[PDB]
């Protein structure tokens, strides 16, 4: 059974022809022939047409070859014994540039190829989450053409945005075959994309981790009249800093599967591996299979990085490529013709109906897809039932309603509200403030027997979060869901103001003081002096309690002259500390790193099947016109002056709508510290 390998260039054919004769001379069976193709994608059609038998492909190419042509990955590459059958994607720029990861707008870019792993799928797939590139109505090509100033993306010839995506491309002696997905285009594949950066045409290049050492330090191809050095380049980290080429183990965009030999499903698999391992085994001697500098080029037949070719157990593109790979593929990849024409929003009031009605008009006049439709529902919980029932598509929910949506109805966040840095009434941190005493210091774990100042019964920061947290941490162990008696037995004395009590423990009112004349003790309103977050903080400073569970702002608003009430008139914030769940103490100004939980901003909950990137894409394109409360475009998404209501569709406090990033689940959005306390209280 002769195996006809496909070649994409003349030097690739010559290497294959020299390898074939090296094979037969060593009596290797079966025979090896080398059919020549115009491109890698042309060759996959040759394989489909039974004109050729095998080819080594990139992940994104294995994907499309396995889908639109149904070929299977039989044998794969092993680059290092360290990275194995995988490699790491990177974005590289010169030393002479300030371009960090999150500063790529209007930047000239170089890519390996369209629908290709390291030069397109991973860089663009990551940019939509953690680089902020929004895609509206599934048009990824429009998004990338507008983001980067100019680009060289081989394979984007007959696309609509060809001008921008093929602007930096040249290729060939004569300047023919420009922007073709062929080695013909001088800036094609890892080698060419890196050359695009170094020849000045582009400012950034999305290539492998190893391609910089492979084309510098004297390993530069002679044809590129130069001799590039490794220390003239740098990687870009997800954190936001520029590291060196050597620390790619820390500075990379994703770990991606290795390339593989794809053959037809009709074609035998074991026949191809036996032929190649026969050669590879005996030649590590008569023929260096993975080197290709003797033909004047890089990565011929197999990438030069390859150390060994291995058999593959499951011969399917879905199994070979990582599950993570296919997920990023189904989101970023959406058919820009088979998306629901409408996005049905959930409304809970006639003013909400009117704002949503006006929002549909403003969006449509500005040609933003999908089109909004408004469906009314009687309750926030009833919206969830209707969303999952495929009658409604989206709704904005509070922290507590996010939990019930994802855990009970399987909903997922599509976008979130983002409040002003100075606004902290909606999304704040729950903290445990204590007096600054070293000789009498204690940890969040040594709270038993102490005196506690809560804001009030059922107060989120003062009761729900802290009690919930102590139950989950295993310090308050209640019996028969009797939480009140468990906390009154844990703390020696507390102040937990309450309204309408029935079997309230005495200990929970022990520290309350009441009126200026002592009346109304422990009452659930301002009549009690220790009521609320400032009352709970006062309860602490007056030495009535030992710990106060309040909001991160409480100490600042009641110290350093910000409160001239005699009890708080002379307070300095330095006399207070915060207790962290990890056991550390911190200055009151470090609440972000030392809090019990953060009350989450609101988020738009949709069904899992709903493409979350079209939802955020619509909202981001919309907010570019209608976000700012003083925009001149005839719609304000985060204002409700025109309607007989407030916080319609979104809280009026919303400054901007944000992508969920890697908090793609209800638990991830709510945070783990916050869900632990919520779940802790449920029992």
């Amino acid at each position: 059974m002769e195996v006809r390998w496909c070649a994409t260039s003349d030097p690739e054919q010559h290497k294959c022809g020299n390898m074939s004769e090296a094979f037969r001379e060593a009596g290797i069976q079966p025979s090896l022939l080398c059919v020549r193709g115009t491109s890698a994608d042309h060759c996959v059609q040759l394989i489909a047409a039974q004109e050729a038998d095998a080819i080594t492909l990139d992940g994104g190419a294995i994907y499309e070859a396995g889908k639109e042509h149904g070929l299977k990955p039989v044998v794969g590459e092993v680059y290092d014994q360290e990275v194995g059958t995988s490699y790491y994607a990177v974005a590289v720029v010169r030393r002479s540039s300030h371009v960090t990861i999150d500063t790529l707008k209007g930047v000239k870019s170089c890519h390996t190829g369209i629908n290709r792993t390291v030069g397109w799928n991973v860089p663009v797939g990551y940019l939509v989450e953690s680089g902020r590139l929004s895609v509206m109505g599934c048009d990824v090509l429009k998004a990338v053409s507008d983001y980067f100033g100019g680009s060289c993306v081989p394979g984007a010839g007959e696309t609509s945005y060809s001008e921008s995506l093929c602007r930096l491309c040249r290729g060939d002696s004569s300047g023919e075959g420009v922007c073709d997905k062929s080695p013909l285009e001088r800036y094609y594949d890892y080698s060419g994309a890196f050359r695009c950066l170094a020849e000045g045409a582009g400012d950034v290049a999305f290539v492998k981790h190893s391609t910089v050492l492979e084309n510098t330090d004297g390993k530069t191809l002679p044809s590129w009249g130069q001799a590039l050095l490794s220390q003239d380049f740098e990687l870009l980290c997800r954190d936001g800093s520029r590291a060196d080429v050597t620390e790619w183990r820390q500075c990379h965009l994703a770990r991606v599967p290795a390339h593989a030999v794809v053959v037809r499903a009709d074609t035998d698999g074991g026949l191809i591996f036996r032929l190649l391992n026969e050669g590879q085994r005996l030649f590590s001697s008569s023929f260096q299979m993975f080197s290709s500098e003797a033909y004047g080029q890089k990565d011929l037949l197999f990438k030069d990085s390859t150390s060994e070719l291995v058999p593959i157990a499951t011969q399917t593109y879905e199994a070979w490529l990582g599950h993570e790979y296919l997920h990023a593929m189904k989101g970023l990849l959406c058919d820009p013709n088979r998306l629901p024409p409408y996005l049905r929003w959930c409304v809970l009031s006639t003013p909400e109906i009117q704002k949503c009605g006006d929002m549909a008009v403003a969006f449509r006049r500005q040609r933003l897809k999908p089109e909004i439709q408004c469906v009314s529902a009687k309750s926030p919980q009833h919206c969830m039932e209707r969303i999952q029932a495929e009658q409604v598509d989206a709704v904005t929910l509070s922290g507590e309603d996010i939990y019930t949506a994802g855990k009970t109805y399987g909903l997922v966040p599509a976008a979130g509200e983002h409040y002003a840095p100075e606004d902290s009434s909606n999304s704040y941190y729950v903290v445990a403030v204590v007096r600054r005493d070293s000789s009498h210091a204690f940890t969040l774990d040594e709270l038993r027997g102490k005196r506690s100042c809560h804001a009030g019964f059922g107060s989120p920061a003062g009761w729900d979060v802290p009690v919930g947290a102590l139950i989950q941490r295993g310090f308050i162990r209640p019996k028969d869901c009797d939480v009140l008696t468990a906390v009154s037995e844990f703390f020696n004395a507390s102040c937990v103001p309450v309204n309408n009590p029935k079997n309230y423990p005495s200990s929970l009112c022990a520290l309350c003081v009441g009126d200026e004349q002592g009346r109304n003790k422990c009452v659930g309103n301002s009549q009690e002096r220790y009521y609320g977050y400032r009352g709970a903080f006062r309860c602490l400073v007056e030495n009535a309690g030992d710990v106060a569970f309040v909001r991160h702002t409480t100490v600042f608003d009641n110290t350093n002259g910000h409160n001239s009430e005699p009890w708080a008139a002379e307070l300095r914030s330095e006399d207070y500390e915060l207790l962290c769940p990890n056991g550390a103490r911190a200055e009151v100004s470090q609440f972000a790193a030392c809090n019990l939980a953060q009350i989450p901003p609101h988020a738009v909950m949709v069904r899992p099947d709903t493409n979350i990137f079209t939802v955020y894409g619509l909202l981001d394109k919309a907010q570019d016109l209608f976000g700012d409360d003083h925009n001149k475009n005839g719609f304000k998404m985060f204002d409700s002056s025109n309607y007989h209501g407030q916080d319609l569709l979104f809280k009026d406090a919303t400054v901007r709508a944000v992508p969920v990033g890697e908090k793609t689940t209800y638990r991830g959005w709510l945070g783990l510290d916050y869900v632990a306390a919520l779940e802790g209280m449920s029992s």
Epitope: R435, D437, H440, R451, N492, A544
Partner: antibody
Framework: QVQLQQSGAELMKPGASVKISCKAT????????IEWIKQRPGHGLEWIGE????????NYNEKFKGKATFTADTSSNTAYMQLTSLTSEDSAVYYC????????????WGQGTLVTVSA | DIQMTQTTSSLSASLGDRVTISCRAS??????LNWYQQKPDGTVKLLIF???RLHSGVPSRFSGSGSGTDYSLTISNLEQEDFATYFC?????????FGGGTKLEIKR
């Protein structure tokens, strides 16, 4: 103002025991720990211990343990200390002080109580 | 225990002088050091808490300084009522420990 007024000078035989008092006025007695300190000529000041009147929690200096005992009656705003098996080495000036709750600082002190052990 | 050692048990000075009394702990007490004044009638006053902060009501002539294990109290423009014994205390760890005292005596 805050004021801690202590009992008068006491004169006991060796082997006996004494109960010093310290009535507090001008603040919430239940909230602040009451420290007890001993002063002898050429022996600086020695912390005997402390008591938080809300719940009676006590912390005693090990070198005293056995000798000193603290109580506090939140209804009468008075804190007590008892010293047992008296000896001339117990003859000293004893102060009650109040812990402000911050930095281990004792902002308000008693006037002192002279205890004299003599046969 | 942490042992607080006061350099000198007695010091002489005259009105208007600048005087520095000094304390030293057996270990790093991270600035948790308080300074007290005792008059001959056994009356005790708190002057400084946490190395340098003045207790409300205390004249500004008294100033505090130090770090690590070495701390000191300074009295600027010395006045009649300042001639008394000065103690140091640590609030770093129980049991709170004091210095031996330093008596400020009138020069003549």
């Amino acid at each position: 103002q805050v004021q801690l007024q202590q009992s008068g000078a006491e004169l006991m035989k060796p082997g006996a025991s004494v109960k010093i008092s310290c009535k507090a006025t001008g603040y919430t007695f239940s909230n602040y720990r009451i420290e007890w300190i001993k002063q002898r000529p050429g022996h600086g000041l020695e912390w005997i211990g402390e008591i938080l009147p809300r719940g009676g929690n006590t912390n005693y200096n090990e070198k005293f343990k056995g000798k000193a005992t603290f109580t506090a009656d939140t209804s009468s705003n008075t804190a007590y200390m008892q010293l047992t098996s008296l000896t001339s080495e117990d003859s000293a000036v004893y102060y009650c002080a109040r812990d402000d709750g911050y930095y281990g600082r004792f902002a308000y002190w008693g006037q002192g109580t002279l205890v004299t052990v003599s046969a | 225990d942490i042992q607080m050692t006061q350099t000198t048990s007695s010091l002489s000075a005259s009105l208007g002088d600048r005087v520095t009394i000094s304390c030293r702990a057996s270990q790093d007490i991270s600035n948790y050091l308080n300074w007290y004044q005792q008059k001959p009638d056994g009356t005790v006053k708190l002057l400084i808490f946490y190395t340098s902060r003045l207790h409300s009501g205390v004249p500004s002539r008294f100033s505090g300084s130090g770090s690590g294990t070495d701390y000191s109290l300074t009295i600027s423009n010395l006045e009649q009522e300042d001639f008394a014994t000065y103690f140091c205390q640590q609030g770093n760890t129980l049991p709170p420990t004091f210095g031996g005292g330093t008596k400020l005596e009138i020069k003549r």
